[PDB]
Write a protein that binds this ligand. Structure first.
Ligand code: 4WI
Ligand code: 4WI
Ligand code: LQZ
Ligand code: LQZ
Lengths: 306, 306
C-alpha cells in the first residue's frame, strides 16, 4: 500500500546527458547515436537572449564553436543544424549507452519524469504533468536548460520534453525533441505569461481510485450522475470536461474497485460543491491532478522496466 | 524557481539490483562486489512468516537453494550467512557496476531516495523521510522487499534502508544494510503498530525557507521568539523540539534569505496557532516536513552528482 509521486528510474537517461558549451554559455545536451540535441539558445550571449535572431547567430558559428563534454571525454562536433528551437550537433562518436528510444509529443494531462541536470550532470528526478495551459510545474535553475522529460515502456525511453524557460508564477515551458514548443511560447527573454490553467479532471478521478485502492474511502457517496450533469458542475470550478474517451480510459480502475466511473464522478461533484471539510485524501488537503490513470495502475500494480 | 519532491538519480543503484529466489519466494537483492544482500524472510514460506525461526530455516538451506538472477545471467551462490535481519549471499562474480558506496544508519528526520523494485527490476523512484516513529511513508507492494533507500554524495552511494514490511495505516518498516531494524519492529507476520508520529520541526522550517526563496512570503510575521518559547508551543502541536544543533544546521538558509532562524520560528508559531487561513505554501495546504535543510540547499542551488 501507500501512494507517492513516483518518477521512472533515470539510469537510461543519465547515460545520455552531456555538457554543451558555446563560447561562454553552458547547458545540457541529450546524446543519442551520433547526435547531441540541445536548446538553440546555447548560441546566445545574455544580450542576444533579449531579442535573438537564431538563424543569424548560427550562421556565425562553425562546428569548432561548440564543445561537447561527455564525462572525461570531449566529443568533436562535425556538423550542426537547427530544427525549430533545438540545435542538433553531429559528433564523431555515437553514444554506446544509447537506449532504445522514441521522440513523442504528449497531450495536456499526460505525465512524465524530468531528469534535472546542470553542466551535463544529473541533480535529481521528479514527476511532472503537462498542464492544460501547456506549462509544467517543475524545479529548474540557471543552467538547467536541455534537461529532458521522458516516459519508459519496458526498455524504450520516450523523450517528450526539453527544458527551455521559466514563466511568471515560476512555471516552466519547453519543447518536444523536434524543437516545437508546447504552448504559444517563444525562446526570447521578453514578457510572456501562461494562460489560465485548469484542473485535469480525468487525473483527479484516477487519484480518487488510488485513494479507494488504499482504503481512503470516506468521500464515496451513494449517488450517481450523468456525464453531462457532472461536466456542467466541473466547468464552474475550472475543471476540464470529462469525455467518453476519459471514461473508457478509467475503465480498468473502475473494474478493479467495482466503482462505476459515473459513481466516482458524483463523489467528485460533492467534493467540489462541499469541499473536503478539513479532511485529507492520501495525505493531501487538496485534490491532486498530476497522476494519470496509467500512473495509478503502474504504481498500484508494480509495473517494472528493463 | 519551483520546488518539487526530488529523488536522487537512480542509475548507480539500478546497476546493483538483482532477483533473489529461494524455492518459491522471490524478492530483490542488492549486488555489491561479490555479495548479494537481501531480506532474510526470502527463506520463508507463507506459513513460516507467521512465526519464523530464521536460524532453523537457514540451517536447512544450502547454497543451491538460492537462485540469483542479474539480467539474463544467473549468478552461482557460493556462500551464505545471516547478519541480523539481512541475508548475505556470496556469489561467484563481483558486480562490475558496483559504485563507490557506504552503509549508513540514518537519524529520524533524514531523507533518502527509494528505488522501488519487483523481481530485481526497477519500478520507480521517490523520496522518503525516516519518521520520528521509525516508519517511512512509502509505496510498496508484494515482492518489493529488498528495495533499498539511499543518498548520493558526488560519486558515493550511501545505502541506508532495505525494505521489509508494511504496518497498519499503510506505513513501512525496514532495516539498515547491517540488517538492524529502524524502530522496535520485527520481521514476523504478527500484529504490530507504529507509535504516535510527530512532525519534524527542523524540516518544516527548511521548507519555509524554500518557500521564501521561491517568493512565497505571506506567512512571514514581524515577530521573533526565544527557542524555549517556540518549543513549548510546538510541543502542544506534536512537533519535535528544535535544538541548537537544528538552529546551526539552518544557518546557511538563514544567511541566504536574511531571515533569522528564530524569526522564522515565530512565523511557524503563528501558523501553528492560527492555521493557514485557506492559503497554500509552495502549492500545499499543509505544512511539509519531509525536506531537510540539505534537501532545500541541494534543490535550490543545483547540486549535481557523478
Ligand atoms: C535554461 N538554462 C534557463 C532555465 C531558466 C532559468 C531560470 N529558471 C528556468 O527554468 N532558461 C532561461 O533562462 C530562458 C532563456 C532566456 C531567458 N529565459 C527565461 O527563462 C526567462 N523567462 C522569460 O523570459 C519568460 F518570462 F519569457 F519566460 C527568465 C526571466 C530568465 C526566467 C531564453 C533564451 C528564453
Ligand atoms: C516484501 N516483499 C513485503 C512488502 C509488504 C507487502 C505489502 N506491503 C509491503 O510493504 N513484506 C511482507 O509482506 C512482510 C513479511 C511478512 C509479512 N509482511 C508484512 O508486511 C505484513 N505486515 C505485518 O505483518 C505487520 F503488521 F507486522 F507489519 C503484511 C500484513 C503482509 C502487510 C514478514 C516476514 C514480516
Ligand atoms: C530511434 C527510433 N527508435 C524507435 C524505437 C529506434 C530505436 O530506438 N532502436 C534501438 C533499438 C531497437 C535497440 C537499442 C537501441 C536503439 C536506438
Ligand atoms: C565499501 C566501503 N566503501 C567506502 C567508501 C569503499 C568503496 O566504496 N570503494 C570503491 C571505490 C573507492 C571506487 C569504486 C568502487 C568502490 C566499491
Amino acid at each position: 500500500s501507500g501512494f507517492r509521486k513516483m518518477a521512472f528510474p533515470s539510469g537510461k537517461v543519465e547515460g545520455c546527458m552531456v555538457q554543451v558549451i558555446c563560447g561562454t554559455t553552458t547547458l545540457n545536451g541529450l546524446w543519442l547515436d551520433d547526435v547531441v540535441y540541445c536548446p538553440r539558445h546555447v548560441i546566445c550571449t545574455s544580450e542576444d537572449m533579449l531579442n535573438p535572431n537564431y538563424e543569424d547567430l548560427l550562421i556565425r558559428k562553425s562546428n569548432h564553436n561548440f564543445l561537447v563534454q561527455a564525462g572525461n571525454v570531449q566529443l568533436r562536433v562535425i556538423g550542426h543544424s537547427m530544427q525549430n528551437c533545438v540545435l542538433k550537433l553531429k559528433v564523431d562518436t555515437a553514444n554506446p549507452k544509447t537506449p532504445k528510444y522514441k521522440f513523442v509529443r504528449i497531450q495536456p494531462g499526460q505525465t512524465f519524469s524530468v531528469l534535472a541536470c546542470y553542466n551535463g550532470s544529473p541533480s535529481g528526478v521528479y514527476q511532472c504533468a503537462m498542464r492544460p495551459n501547456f506549462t509544467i510545474k517543475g524545479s529548474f535553475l540557471n543552467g538547467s536548460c536541455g534537461s529532458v522529460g521522458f516516459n519508459i515502456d519496458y526498455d524504450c525511453v520516450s523523450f517528450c520534453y526539453m527544458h527551455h524557460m521559466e514563466l511568471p508564477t515560476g512555471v516552466h515551458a519547453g519543447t518536444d525533441l523536434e524543437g516545437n514548443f508546447y504552448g504559444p511560447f517563444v525562446d526570447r527573454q521578453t514578457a510572456q505569461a501562461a494562460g489560465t490553467d485548469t484542473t485535469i479532471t480525468v487525473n483527479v478521478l484516477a487519484w480518487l481510485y488510488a485513494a479507494v485502492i488504499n482504503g481512503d474511502r470516506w468521500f464515496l457517496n451513494r449517488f450517481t450522475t450523468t456525464l453531462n450533469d457532472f461536466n456542467l458542475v466541473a466547468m464552474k470550478y475550472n475543471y476540464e470536461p470529462l469525455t467518453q474517451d476519459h471514461v473508457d480510459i478509467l475503465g480498468p480502475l473502475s473494474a478493479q474497485t467495482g466503482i462505476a466511473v459515473l459513481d466516482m464522478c458524483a463523489s467528485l461533484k460533492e467534493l467540489l460543491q462541499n469541499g473536503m471539510n478539513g479532511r485529507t485524501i492520501l495525505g493531501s488537503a487538496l485534490l491532486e491532478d498530476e497522476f494519470t490513470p496509467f500512473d495509478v495502475v503502474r504504481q498500484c500494480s508494480g509495473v517494472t522496466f528493463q
